Design a protein around this ligand. Structure first.
Ligand SMILES: CC[C@H](C)[C@@H]1NC(=O)[C@@H](NC(=O)[C@@H]2Cc3ccc(cc3)OCCCCC(=O)N[C@@H](C(C)C)C(=O)N2)Cc2ccc(cc2)OCCCNC1=O
Lengths: 99, 99
């Protein structure tokens, strides 16, 4: 599909058995999802945004379906006002920027 | 052009007559450029993201050429980690997400 940018490019994703709304984010190296009691082993990580760094839990090889497209990779969990799908998963669904 | 996402989608822009590298960020409502001098009057504003808020200088109706495409809109100037082209200007150059 094609998504314009008049508004935030929010789409439905499925992770850990739950459906959530997430932002297709070309400005994010990583995928960060709002605090979720996700099971599995994790490693601590710090990621930086416009205002500074925040602590997140890094989970590997997590299946994540994006608008019906299956992906699997690293998902970071932490306090974020919006669920973010980063380039690590956007590449998996063959997403591009076009103009 | 069609840009894949294995790497950060950085492109060269010209703003205020100067060249800079900036990130095409579909996850940003606004455009934020590193501290620099820009013609005209600016208004103090605050913008947020991961890590919290930062103080910026809001300049309106600023011409920005993004990899050959023209845009004229709001540019926030402040201590951002990287130069960011947000949806306000991405829409102007006709950029869309495709997958
Ligand atoms: C998940 C973030 C990701 C790890 C990070 N990218 C951003 O934070 C990028 N910003 C974003 O992804 C956020 C996403 C977001 C969207 C809506 C949000 C919060 C966060 O709701 C509240 C704020 C709404 C206003 C907004 O759109 N803020 C933008 C900002 C650039 C204007 C923002 O921070 N977008 C910008 C950036 C910052 C630092 C960068 C590279 C790029 O280099 C540091 C190392 C790599 N970091 C990243 O890739």
């Amino acid at each position: 599909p094609q998504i314009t940018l008049w508004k935030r490019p929010l789409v439905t994703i499925r992770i850990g058995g739950q459906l959530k709304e997430a932002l297709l984010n070309t400005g994010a190296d990583d995928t960060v999802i709002e605090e979720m009691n996700l099971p599995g082993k994790w490693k601590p990580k710090m990621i930086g945004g416009i205002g500074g760094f925040i602590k997140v839990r890094q989970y590997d090889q997590i299946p994540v379906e994006i608008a019906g497209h299956k992906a699997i990779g690293t998902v970071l969990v932490g306090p974020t006002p919006v669920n973010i799908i980063g380039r690590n998963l956007l590449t998996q669904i063959g997403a591009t920027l076009n103009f």
